[PDB]
Design a protein around this ligand. Structure first.
Ligand SMILES: NC(=O)C1=CN([C@@H]2O[C@H](COP(=O)(O)OP(=O)(O)OC[C@H]3O[C@@H](n4cnc5c(N)ncnc54)[C@H](OP(=O)(O)O)[C@@H]3O)[C@@H](O)[C@H]2O)C=CC1
Ligand SMILES: CCCCCCCCCCCC(=O)OC[C@H](COP(=O)(O)OCC[N+](C)(C)C)OC(=O)CCCCCCCCCCC
Lengths: 94, 355, 185, 341, 89, 123
């Protein structure tokens, strides 16, 4: 019986439409989360992988920045409006 | 225009020598002349009663003990119609005050269970005697006791024993007393019938669900008390407001389950065990079943055929299987739509995902 | 006192069985996802029992933190009809369910051994009888743990797999966009 | 294991009482910023307001709507409180003066801040009505989108010190607090903290749903109370992450020369005065940052969901995936990669 | 070695004998991957080796990306049809 | 432009009885098809047939009206009420205004001959 062990037990026991940016934000959270979680071993082995695993993780991050670039310039997460304001010109046949 | 649907005439005269001229068409502003007194308007039946009395301008005196349960009665009439007094059966002056200026009195007192300050005797017998003696002293023209169905002076149930003693004492001090004997009442926010079968996690019967009875909608009993308060033919009389259709407990439960579309839970464990579990639950402060009521689970409704009925008042009492839909639709879960097939082709035409 | 914490692994085994049966039997799928979360927790428990709390936490912050958030994020938005577990529809599988259970379990247990006689391959799996001694040496000098070792090998010895997982994640970005996002313009 | 019980009860009392009076501190701080006063009538200067709101809500009915679930609306607030509370275990108030004292304390906090989302996820399923299930989705997308940004900062600073022990991360801040070399990360971490708690200027769903008939947290009774002891504790917790990551935690002026001058020996007085000084530095830092949550609330208007997701994935993330490259380079330039101890 | 095999087998059987919906199929896939990782990590402990934990972390990555792609594919199906009926794929 | 709501019809005064006959019949048909919706949306305590009976009564009310303009007015008012009911604008009270009969018998004495009206001063 440790104080962490005593505490981690005590506390508990005492039709529609959607925009596809709503769903992409979740679907894209996965890979970016796996990237930032795969970066943990680097930060905890950063000395032992001196200057080799540094370069390796940079090529890793650059490859991932590519996909981020693709996401931005597609404008995936932007919401798009249908009822546009008219910008044609007013032209009268004579 | 509105109508005095409760009165047959506009000039009425009580048996105490008061003249009561009606005023109006019979709406919120009208006055019936009458002044009544209802000793349990805070409860399930008396609430519907004061609503029907004060809809037409009848002055209503409402003794209360809790200030906060009652407030839902002031809505029922114009200013000055509903009048409130704080009262207790252990204070006599309070009862004389409540009944002094009344042409009509209505006793709805009675718990379905015992307490520390009131046993079944003290509340169904002595309280009736106190009210009767004051109804007699002041010589109130009318008195309308309500004593439970199946009442019998000596019986396995102490409740029905007291309810029978309350009958004979009232009628042996106030000879002109009217006595009503309603059968198990049902309706919206009922005590022990439909809200229980619809909410209680599990039912129990020390018998089988076999106790036979004739239930009745409470609004109709309130209509009956209205049609008795004003009809002076009903002095020294007795009524049996039971209902057209005989229903065993298991029949009611099956209709409740059908209408709810959920499987009501019933257990049917024996008598002594349930009687013990009830006895031990009487020490917590909130009402629960009490040892004397599982005793009444073995006592089906014996109807007295010598007493008047609904048909002596021009009433057409209602049927349970029709009204159960109105009363149980709120607990109806209504899971989802039936048979979604033959809808894919229709759904395929609509845009489900915008970009 | 000692043996109060002896059968925790068997408890987790029993609980995983329960959560699997509950995932299979539940009416509304949302409940089935909640039971999947219970299963990932039990797995994280078991991994702590055998000395890998780092993976317990990585599971709780990956699977539960993202995948199951997303599963609820989907079933909240989609009209996923169902058919509650029944007896007219699913009983027919009982003989095949039972045969498949017995065979697949006995094979999955016999497979891990190198004995030549069949029955002995299973009786070897059921030989979990003897305790493993743990000796203490003094050769480890650093504070290297499992995560540091994983970083070292993954970023030095197996760099190529890392630089391919980057492309798997590029697919995880780029495929869902192409599928969901209509580049009409 | 008696003193372990004593130490738990001390901690729980201190944290819960701090939460209760953070409610009052929120209201009085916000008031004086608005040139009014109060609560200052329910106690001796309002020091009993929070317990009055509680006791009123515990004597209140437990009412459940017809078409709702019971178990989900009940356990989900309870599990939110639990998950928010167990994050307090790994939080140090002195060098090893911690209940957990794990070697994976960062990862414990990071996994528990991932378990936190489920309260908002299960809220929308408490209402079978259709719009609530989209309002919860808006409020989940903000959290899971901003947890990427809080994490990324945990990793950026752990590049400086290669250990997941919280005490070790604080002890490396004797030389300098990590808010001086990474000052912009202080703003970013404080912005994202305010977002993850769904606090203003990031209170989109509670407002957008306060207008509508639902899509909010329409609870009552005890679940209200637990949700309001889980919001005002996740606030302190996220403020603590800012503290022990960037602001030195329990660190302060070197109290070497003072303790040398005044004591002469290691007694059970010096240990007390030391733990007082450490915790006081940790506390005043939490106070200034809780003040900052309130300060921000009093000023800035609200965001919309498009402005907010755009803020995250198009402005913050690029800067961070840039910082992921500049800092390892900055260490490699100078031959200063930290060791595993 | 036991718990992993059991979750794997039961989840394969619940994948195969699911006449009800599809989210059970997704769940059974994820549980199969979980049971694999537990088998492998048990063996990696008993051997005191690292290749097992490496393949485990790799499985976690790949499974998360699997679920991402699967739940975009489902969203495409739903785009076109509007309802994911019990017996449709 | 301020666009019309869901079931809005533009007000158009027909010049003939023969066209308004058709328009009224379409309105009656829509009321009947929509009566179950009028039972679901409003928490109703009676039958769909009783709703259809009341609808038939309300259309029999003005069955013998030969002035064309008054008929056009009646048709427009009826389409207004259909739009009010099918879109969930009305609440229960405004709908059960049309069903006094279903509510419980109001008392006992409902005078129908002279003498009772005289005793109640309603003659
Ligand atoms: N409802 C049924 O199914 C049946 C009812 N009856 C009888 O009809 C009457 C109906 O009462 P019900 O409709 O059941 O709802 P209640 O039984 O709750 O009505 C009880 C009323 O009696 C008052 N009361 C009870 N005990 C005392 C007391 N000791 N001193 C003062 N006032 C008291 C209560 O006042 P407060 O609420 O302020 O405490 C309440 O207003 C009762 O007499 C009952 O015996 C008979 C057969 C069946
Ligand atoms: C508890 C003791 C008790 O029994 O209460 C005693 C009092 C009464 O409480 P009060 O009426 O609400 O405060 C008075 C509010 N005046 C307005 C009215 O407590 C207090 O004032 C505060 C107790 C000390 C606060 C501890 C921090 C003017």
């Amino acid at each position: 019986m440790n104080t962490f062990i005593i505490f981690i037990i005590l506390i508990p026991i005492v039709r529609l439409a959607f925009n596809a940016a709503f769903i992409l934000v979740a679907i894209l959270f996965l890979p970016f989360d796996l990237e930032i979680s795969t970066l943990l071993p680097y930060v905890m082995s950063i000395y032992l992988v001196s200057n080799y695993g540094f370069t390796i993780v940079l090529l890793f991050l650059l490859i991932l920045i590519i996909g981020f670039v693709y996401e931005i310039n597609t404008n995936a997460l932007k919401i798009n409006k249908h009822n546009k304001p008219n910008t044609d010109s007013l032209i009268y046949k004579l | 225009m509105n109508s005095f649907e409760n009165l047959a005439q506009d000039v009425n005269i009580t048996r105490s020598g008061k003249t009561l001229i009606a005023k109006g068409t019979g709406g919120r502003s009208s006055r019936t002349g009458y002044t009544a007194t209802v000793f349990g308007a805070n409860g399930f039946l008396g609430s519907y009663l004061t609503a029907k009395l004060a809809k037409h301008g009848t002055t209503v005196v409402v003794p209360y003990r809790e200030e906060m349960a009652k407030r839902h009665l002031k809505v029922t009439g114009d200013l000055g119609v509903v009048n409130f007094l704080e009262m207790d059966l252990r204070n006599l002056e309070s009862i004389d005050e409540a009944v002094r200026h009344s042409d009509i009195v209505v006793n709805l007192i009675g718990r379905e269970y015992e307490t520390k300050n009131f046993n079944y005797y003290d509340v169904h017998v002595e309280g009736a005697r106190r009210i009767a003696e004051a109804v007699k002293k002041h010589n109130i023209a009318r008195y309308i006791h309500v004593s439970a169905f199946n009442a019998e002076i000596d019986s396995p149930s102490e409740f029905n024993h007291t309810k029978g003693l309350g009958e004979q004492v009232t009628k042996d001090i106030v000879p002109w007393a009217t006595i009503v004997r309603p059968a198990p009442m049902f309706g919206r926010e009922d005590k022990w019938f439909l809200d229980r079968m619809a909410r209680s996690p599990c039912l129990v019967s020390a018998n089988k669900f076999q106790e036979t009875s004739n239930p009745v909608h409470v609004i109709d009993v309130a209509a009956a008390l209205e049609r008795i308060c004003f009809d002076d033919s009903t002095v020294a009389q007795t009524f049996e407001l039971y209902g057209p259709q005989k229903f065993t407990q298991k029949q009611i439960i099956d209709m409740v389950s059908e209408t709810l579309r959920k499987e009501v839970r019933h257990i049917e464990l024996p008598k002594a065990l349930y009687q013990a579990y009830t006895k031990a639950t009487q020490a917590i402060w909130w009402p629960t079943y009490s040892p004397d009521q599982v005793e009444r689970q073995f006592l089906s409704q014996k109807i007295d055929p010598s007493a008047k009925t609904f048909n002596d008042l021009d009433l057409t009492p209602m049927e349970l299987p029709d009204l159960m839909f109105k009363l149980i639709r709120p607990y109806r879960v209504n899971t989802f739509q039936h048979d979604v097939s033959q809808l894919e082709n229709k759904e395929k035409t609509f845009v489900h995902i915008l970009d | 006192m000692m043996y109060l914490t002896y059968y925790f692994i068997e408890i987790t085994i029993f609980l995983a069985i329960l959560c699997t049966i509950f995932i299979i039997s539940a009416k509304n799928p949302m409940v089935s996802i909640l039971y999947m979360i219970a299963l990932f927790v039990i797995a994280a428990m078991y991994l702590y029992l055998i000395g890998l709390g780092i993976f317990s936490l990585l599971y709780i912050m990956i699977y539960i933190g993202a995948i199951a958030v997303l599963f609820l994020f989907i079933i909240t938005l989609l009209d996923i009809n169902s058919t509650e577990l029944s007896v007219k529809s699913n009983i027919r599988d009982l003989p095949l369910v039972l045969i498949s259970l017995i065979v697949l379990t006995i094979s999955g247990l016999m497979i891990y051994s190198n004995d030549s006689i069949l029955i002995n391959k299973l009786l070897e799996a059921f030989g979990n009888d003897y305790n493993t001694i743990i000796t203490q040496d003094w050769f480890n000098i650093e504070n290297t743990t499992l995560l540091t070792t994983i970083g070292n090998v993954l970023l030095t010895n197996n760099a190529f797999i890392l630089l391919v997982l980057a492309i798997v994640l590029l697919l995880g970005i780029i495929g869902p966009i192409s599928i969901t996002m209509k580049h009409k313009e | 294991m008696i003193i372990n019980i004593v130490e738990i009860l001390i901690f729980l009392v201190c944290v819960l009482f701090s939460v209760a009076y953070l409610t009052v501190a929120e209201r009085k701080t916000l008031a004086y910023m608005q040139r009014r006063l109060g609560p200052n009538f329910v106690g001796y200067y309002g020091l009993l307001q929070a317990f009055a709101d509680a006791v009123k809500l515990l004597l209140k009915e437990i009412v459940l709507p017809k078409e709702s679930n019971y178990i989900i609306l009940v356990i989900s607030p309870l599990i939110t409180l639990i998950t928010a509370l167990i994050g307090w275990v790994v939080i140090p108030l002195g060098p090893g003066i911690t209940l957990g004292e794990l070697n994976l304390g960062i990862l414990f906090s990071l996994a528990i801040g991932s378990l936190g989302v489920f309260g908002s996820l299960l809220s929308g399923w408490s209402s079978n009505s259709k719009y609530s299930l989209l309002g919860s989705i808006r409020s989940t997308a903000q959290l899971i989108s901003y947890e990427l940004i809080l994490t990324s900062i945990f990793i950026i600073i752990i590049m400086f010190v290669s250990s997941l022990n919280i005490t070790t991360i604080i002890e490396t801040q004797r030389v300098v607090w990590y808010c001086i070399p990474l000052l912009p990360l202080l703003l970013i971490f404080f912005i994202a903290s305010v977002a993850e708690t769904a606090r203003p200027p990031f209170d989109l769903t509670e407002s957008e749903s306060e207008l509508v008939a639902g899509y909010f947290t329409e609870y009552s009774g005890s679940p209200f109370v637990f949700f309001f002891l889980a919001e005002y504790s996740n606030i302190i917790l996220i403020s603590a992450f800012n503290g022990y990551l960037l602001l030195g935690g329990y660190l302060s002026f070197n109290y070497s020369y003072l303790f040398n001058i005044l004591f002469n020996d290691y007694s059970y007085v010096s240990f007390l005065f030391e733990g007082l000084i450490n915790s006081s530095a940790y506390a005043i830092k939490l106070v200034f940052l809780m003040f900052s949550f309130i300060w921000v609330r009093a000023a800035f208007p609200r965001f919309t969901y498009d402005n907010l997701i755009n803020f995250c994935w198009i402005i913050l993330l690029p800067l961070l995936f840039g910082i992921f490259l500049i800092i390892p380079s900055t260490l490699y330039i100078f031959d200063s990669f930290p060791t595993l101890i | 070695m036991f718990i992993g095999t059991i979750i794997l087998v039961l989840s394969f059987l619940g994948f195969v004998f699911n006449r009800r919906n599809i989210i059970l199929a997704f769940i059974c896939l994820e549980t199969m991957l979980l049971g694999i990782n537990l088998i492998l990590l048990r063996n990696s402990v008993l051997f005191d080796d690292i290749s097992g934990s490496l393949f485990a972390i790799v499985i976690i990555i790949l499974a998360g990306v699997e679920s991402a792609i699967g739940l975009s594919l489902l969203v495409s199906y739903y785009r076109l049809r509007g309802v994911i009926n019990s017996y449709g794929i | 432009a301020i666009i019309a709501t869901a079931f809005a019809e533009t007000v158009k005064f027909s010049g003939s009885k023969q066209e308004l006959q058709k328009r009224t019949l379409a309105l009656y048909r829509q009321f009947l098809r929509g009566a179950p919706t009028f039972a679901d949306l409003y928490e109703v305590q009676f039958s769909i047939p009783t709703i259809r009976t009341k609808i038939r009564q309300e259309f029999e009310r003005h069955r013998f009206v030969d002035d064309l303009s008054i008929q056009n007015v009646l048709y427009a008012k009826g389409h207004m009420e259909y739009q009010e009911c099918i879109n969930f604008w009305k609440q229960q009270a405004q709908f059960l205004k049309y069903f006094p009969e279903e509510d419980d018998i109001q008392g006992r004495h409902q005078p129908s001959n002279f003498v009772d009206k005289f005793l109640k001063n309603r003659a």
